[PDB]
Structure formats: C-alpha cells, structure tokens
Design an enzyme around this catalytic site. Structure first.
Site, short mmCIF file in Angstrom:
data_model
loop_
_atom_site.label_atom_id
_atom_site.label_comp_id
_atom_site.label_asym_id
_atom_site.label_seq_id
_atom_site.Cartn_x
_atom_site.Cartn_y
_atom_site.Cartn_z
N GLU A 117 0.86 -1.21 0.00
CA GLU A 117 0.00 0.00 0.00
C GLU A 117 0.89 1.25 0.00
OE1 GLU A 117 -2.69 0.20 3.32
OE2 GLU A 117 -3.59 2.09 2.62
N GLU A 122 -3.43 10.75 2.62
CA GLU A 122 -4.46 10.50 3.66
C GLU A 122 -4.52 11.77 4.50
OE1 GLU A 122 -4.91 6.23 5.14
OE2 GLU A 122 -2.71 6.45 4.91
#
Ligand code: NA
Length: 321
Positions: free
Chosen positions: A139, A144
């Site tokens: 990932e 974010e």
C-alpha cells in the site's frame, strides 16, 4: 445500466480517460449490484477533470459511508494499472470541506488487474497493508488527509502480490510532527487548506531501477513548498528514504519497490472510523491539532455535524521524471 463516471487525467502529457468504479461492499448482497454514482455522491465535472467525492448524500436513500473508488481501464473489465517508479504523480485538491477525523485518501495497492475473479468492474479483490491473506498487499498512501493534517506512507509487504507480511505502521511522515504551522485551514499555515493546492510526489529510482526516495512538494499561489526536514535518529531527512524508514521505525522501501513492478490500482477512498479516536493516528496528539477520542469524530456523528463534508480532486497527472 450502471453509468460509471469518466475521469480524464494526463499520462506524460496525453489525455487518458479511466472509468470510476465503486467497491463491491456498496453493491448489495451479491456484491455485483448496480451503483448510482449520483446517489453515492461521486461526481465528475463536465470537462472530465474534477472528481467530487461526498461523505454523505441523500437522494431517494442516504449514503452515509462516503465511497471507495478504483480507476478502471476504458475496457470496463480491468483496473487502470500504474507503475509509479521513476514517475511523479500530481493532483490539485480542495480539502476545505474536510473536518478533523475524516480521511480523504488517494493511494495505490497491488490489487490484481482483474480484482477477485476477473470482475474489477464490480470493485472486487481489495487488499491493503492492514489486511490478512488475500486482503494483505503493498500500500502506497500518497494522500491520507483532512483540512487539519496529512500523512504520506509506504507500507512495504514481502512477498509481493496478495498475502505477504506487511508493515502496518508504514514508513510515513506527517509534517505536523516537525512544524505545527506547515499544514492547516488558514493563511497562518505554509499550506492553506481553506484554498485549493497541488500535491506533487516524486518516486525517485536509482540507476538499477530500485525506489530510493519519495519526495513530497506542494504548490499554492504559484509557490513551490517543500516539506519540513524531519529529525529521526539525530539526523535530518527531506524525503522517505531507506535511511529515514530505518531511523523512524518503519520497514524500508524495497518491498514496495518490487510490488510497483507488478502494477498498482489507484484507490480514492473518503471514509471516517465508526470508533471515537479511529483517525487520531492521522490528525490528533503529535500528528495534528484535532480533539482525541472524539465521539463526534465517529462517522455517524461526523456526517450529522458536517453533512456537506466532501473532497475535490482535479487534473490528476503522472509524468516520467
Ligand atoms: Na494535538
């Protein structure tokens, strides 16, 4: 028939159109039900350039869960595969409608091109660094963030593909840990999240082709804004490097370096935790100014307090370094 939004982005200066498809979790009991993107609050502008993603949308029913979206190839059957090594990825973003405890995520994972069973159009086969078995894969959390805090993370897993052992914490940086005035929702911050800005990420390789450096810069008001130098193990770092990852207690970039050679899927996921303090790792304590363990920060309360919470992404571009 499902009408998937068409998002036009730039690959080395050429206009590429991908389809937007929502995760199987949103597709009812079969996981292959049709999606109304207007109803899930997923909108692309007339010019095909701007993706709007709403947390909560009421039509004839109420979407309360934001959305997890994948870029799907124009073939309408396979995910739009990218290898970011030796590339930069940039996008324009409006974060101004994202309060504390929401997570506007734009990231890549080593999902299979065909998803679970050659059915990528149904948003199947999701994996990330927090999964187990088929649900575990490399990932690259490019983005974010909310209006109050942002984190960049590389989660290396070994082996590559699905079901490896993952660095769940990741090799990550949040500028708030170094400079509490770098990123926030006013002119008092270096990056003013009340106004649109560009997020630039360089995936630098060595001569041999290994990922060696992940460099974050911002652009706002025509100013190029480097990230603050971070101290780890008594040394200053200006990027994610294997040295920084080691010094900061992350796993190195090597697992991710191998993984990106297989091709990654681009994920755009707007979400909030069902638990108070679920997003504190991102935006509370030493990671941001947000209230800790906030019951109002849990998804069901957040969407009541901030029913217009949304993210806008524009002018996605991938360019060879
Ligand atoms: Na704090």
């Amino acid at each position: 028939g499902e009408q998937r939004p068409k998002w036009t982005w730039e690959l080395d200066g050429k206009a590429v159109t991908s389809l937007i498809t929502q995760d199987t979790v949103s597709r009812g009991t079969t996981g292959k039900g049709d999606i109304d993107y207007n109803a899930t609050g997923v909108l692309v502008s007339e010019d095909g350039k701007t993706l709007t993603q709403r947390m909560r949308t009421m039509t004839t029913w109420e979407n309360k869960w934001g959305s997890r979206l994948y870029l799907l190839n124009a073939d309408g059957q396979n995910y739009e595969m990218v290898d970011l090594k030796g590339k930069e990825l940039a996008f324009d973003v409006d974060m101004s409608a994202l309060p504390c405890s929401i997570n506007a995520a734009l990231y890549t994972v080593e999902m299979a091109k065909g998803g679970a069973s050659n059915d990528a159009q149904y948003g199947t086969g999701y994996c990330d660094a927090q999964g187990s078995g088929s649900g575990a894969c490399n990932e690259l959390d490019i983005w974010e963030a909310n209006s109050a805090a942002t984190q960049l993370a590389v989660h290396s897993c070994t082996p590559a593909g699905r079901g490896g052992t993952c660095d769940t914490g990741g090799c990550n940086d949040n500028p708030y840990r170094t400079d509490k005035t770098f990123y926030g929702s006013s002119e008092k911050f270096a990056v003013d999240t009340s106004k649109p800005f560009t997020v630039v990420t360089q995936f630098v390789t060595g001569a041999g082709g290994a990922l060696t450096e992940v460099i974050r810069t911002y652009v706002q008001g025509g100013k190029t804004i480097p990230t603050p130098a971070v101290t780890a193990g008594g040394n200053q770092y200006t990027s994610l490097t294997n040295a920084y990852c080691s010094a900061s207690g992350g796993k190195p970039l090597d697992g991710m370096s191998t993984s990106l050679d297989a091709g990654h899927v681009i994920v755009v996921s707007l979400w909030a935790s069902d638990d108070a303090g679920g997003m504190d790792w991102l935006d509370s304590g030493n990671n941001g100014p947000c209230a800790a363990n906030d019951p109002d920060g849990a998804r069901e309360q957040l969407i009541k307090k901030y029913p217009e919470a949304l993210v806008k992404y524009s002018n996605l571009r991938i360019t060879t370094l």
